[PDB]
Amino acid sequence: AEKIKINNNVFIYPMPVTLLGANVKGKANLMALGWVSRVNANPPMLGVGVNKSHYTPEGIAENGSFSVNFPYSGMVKKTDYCGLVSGEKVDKSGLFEVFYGELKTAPMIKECTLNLECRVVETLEFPTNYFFVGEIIAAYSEEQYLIQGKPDIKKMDPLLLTMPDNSYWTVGDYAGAALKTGKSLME
Amino acid sequence: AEKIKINNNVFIYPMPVTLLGANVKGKANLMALGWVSRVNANPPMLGVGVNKSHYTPEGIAENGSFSVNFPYSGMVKKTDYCGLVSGEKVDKSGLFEVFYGELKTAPMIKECTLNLECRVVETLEFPTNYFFVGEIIAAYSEEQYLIQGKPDIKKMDPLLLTMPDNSYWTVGDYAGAALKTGKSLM
């Protein structure tokens, strides 16, 4: 099969599905977020991609903090709703049970399986988006999501996202041991 | 029940599974990469998070270019191999069939399902990792991975990753229409 040139506007296959929390004018906001990735190993840093058109960036700029929150699959609707409406027009502070942590100002979602509380280290600006690089200063889960002290993805049952087809997916079958199977081909 | 604090070195659940391609000293190199995200809508830009201890950043730094390649699930072994061995000591240029694009500087993998050829726009440095921001200037797939010229993830069959438990996963079942199912709560 020959290689075909396609539209340059391609998204990652798949994206994760997260809820991004920020205080904006003292009130908790949440937006749906798929543009999240680790950036730095030590200290542990992630980055978050946010359109300049959204309400959320004002809050992240104000507070220098944000959270990354992982819903389970049964929260699909509330999650999607947070990616359909803006905090500019619609109060999203009441949709979830909100808790705060050490940074005081990054609102986190009680119902989410995992919450990463982040301190803005650097705000990167690109033509249509900010990418807020944050240090993970505290991480929260619950015992029922952990195996040997660490998050277990099957317990979490997180969502996945694909655009512009606009689909949600869940995690499928185990597919091998990472940093392991490749050793089979070594030396 | 109650929230409990766990260790701060937390990865995204799950990560994507990608092969990062660069020329180093005129020779193709590939590493496994889960630290990638889109960073700008228009023009299309992604960012890649790369340890300073790796061989690949030397190549991206030389060339001002790199590629992002999506293996399908049957490629797990060679993919993990690329995440274990460094081009510093082990030549990885022959592991896969390599093709180049418009830039002629960023090596892409024929066997992969989707190849993104990227021009570095901005390079950031953090204490242990570079963060290279690239513009997607060319994107390559095959008819067999496409619906109306658009990648279909089930045809692609890409790998997912979780760490530090170090598990690969594939994609599961359709779970709803994004930017749609949530319309009910309005």
Ligand SMILES: Cc1cc2nc3c(=O)[nH]c(=O)nc-3n(C[C@H](O)[C@H](O)[C@H](O)COP(=O)(O)O)c2cc1C
């Ligand atoms: C599943 C999903 C993922 C999304 N991911 C992002 C993203 O990564 N970055 C972004 O800027 N917008 C993203 N959006 C769109 C925003 O969440 C949406 O416009 C939201 O209403 C912004 O909220 P706000 O105005 O209160 O900040 C996503 C939407 C959906 C439904």
Ligand SMILES: Cc1cc2nc3c(=O)[nH]c(=O)nc-3n(C[C@H](O)[C@H](O)[C@H](O)COP(=O)(O)O)c2cc1C
């Ligand atoms: C599946 C998996 C994902 C990985 N993701 C990243 C990553 O996102 N960033 C990074 O710096 N290293 C990552 N690594 C580690 C590098 O891929 C690995 O150290 C590789 O051997 C580097 O090779 P190089 O020295 O030729 O660049 C990953 C490893 C595995 C197996």
